[model samples]
Target chain A: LAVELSSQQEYLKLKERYDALQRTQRNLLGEDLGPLSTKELESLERQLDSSLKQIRALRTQFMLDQLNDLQSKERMLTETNKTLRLRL
Target chain B: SVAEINAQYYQQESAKLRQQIISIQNSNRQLMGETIGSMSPKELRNLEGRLERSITRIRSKKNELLFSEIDYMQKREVDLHNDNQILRAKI
Candidate 1:
């Protein structure tokens, strides 16, 4: 429950930061987020990769947990009713 | 004949309650789908820290709502089950 994650916010933040970084890079490169220097762009790319991984994990976890909860509740009700019927 | 009628009524009530439970379950599924569908990959990728924080807060709120909805339905199901059980026992 508490462990569930959502990538929406984190992904947005990372993108904003990436955009800001790109802006700076563009200033240096004379207007363009791409075509950055190999070393700098590689550094930024690494950060982007890390962010992507985190976001993906969040999305997966959210879906898994949500589905699991729904399944669990359905089972709980079905089982409880079954038990009650058996008791009778 | 009265007992038979009462049992029949209880069965009908139980069936209706079961449908209510199913409806709630379906609603939950829709909510889940909506949450996932509402988000876009491109928008997610473009999020800034402030936006991320906002989303996190909103998601937590939504999760709370989701849990409460399930709990409410479960309670209703339980209450109806008990009523049915009592009626069956009487019969």
Candidate 2:
């Protein structure tokens, strides 16, 4: 009986979280807009626009990683080409 | 009697949760652009315009994705150039 009761609580708890995520994904996919007034639409877009900026920080770090590797590889090759030219 | 009572409530709770899950699942289909067709034309246009603003932000961010790839191609070409020289020295 205790096992059965705990499982029911577990079921309802997870359902709450699942519903929350479902709504968020709806807004993220650009659906569920009819329910939001322009103010809420602006509000929602404002949050995501900031978050969009936030996610872009990852790309900058990503770009930096590529940039540094290019410098290193290019430096190596330039030296390599210079050394080969001398040897030949 | 107690066992019967517990079983009955369990059935009730399970059925209710299953019904809500089914409804939410049905609604989830419209979350994407493909299945969503119930909006007014004004809504469809407005949301699209609102969503387009985000794309401007997204494309601005995503542009660097190409920039980085080209940088890789440039260095990769240089790396190949160096490898060719090494090979020439061998031959």
Candidate 3:
């Protein structure tokens, strides 16, 4: 019974944390802004703008990496084609 | 009796968590304009980091705005005090 009670307590604690995290995640995504004041909205807007800037920067870098990989693959294929043509 | 109470409590907690998860997912779809269920953990981590930074920026902006407003109000208070003094001298 003691063990059972402990486990139940642990589950409740975890659930509480999960709920809190969800609330924050929603707020970060700009949902449920009606409860916020004008000052709060201003702050949220700035924060979102900063996050957007960072996300865009990361996306650009990721695309650049993909482009480099594709370019390398193209180069290797062209080399293989040249060798196969000479043998034909 | 304790066991039954515990079971009910657990069920309620589980339901609440499930409900919140669903709500968050629905909001994510609207915010992203697409379902994010296919996102990799690495992508999610990146997004989380961005959100954390955004929250930090928002807090600082709020403080800055508050300070500026306070400064402006203080200046106005001084101006009003000087006007009151001038009016008293005329009387």
Model 2's i-RMS, to one decimal, reads 12.1
Stretches off by above 4 angstroms in model 2 are: A1-17, B1-91
**Candidate order, DockQ descending:** 3, 2, 1
* Candidate achieving higher TM-score, 1 or 3: 3
Residue pairs in clash, model 2: none
lDDT of 2 by residue, A42-63 (tens): 5555655554443344445557
| Predicted structure 2, TM vs. truth | 0.42
The residue ranges of model 1 lying beyond 4 angstroms of the native Cα positions read: A1-22, A25-31, A80-88, B1-91
Q: Pick the candidate with the highest TM-score.
A: 3
Error of 3 at B11 (Å): 8.9
* Per-model lDDT: 0.52, 0.61, 0.66
Ranking by TM-score: 3, 2, 1
RMSD of 1: 36.1
lDDT of 1 by residue, B1-91 (tens): 6555555555555555555555554543332232333455544444324234433444444455567779999999999999999999997
Where is model 3 more than 4 Å wrong at Cα?
A: A1-25, B2-91
Clashing pairs in 1: A9-B52, A12-B47, A12-B48, A13-B47, A13-B48, A13-B49
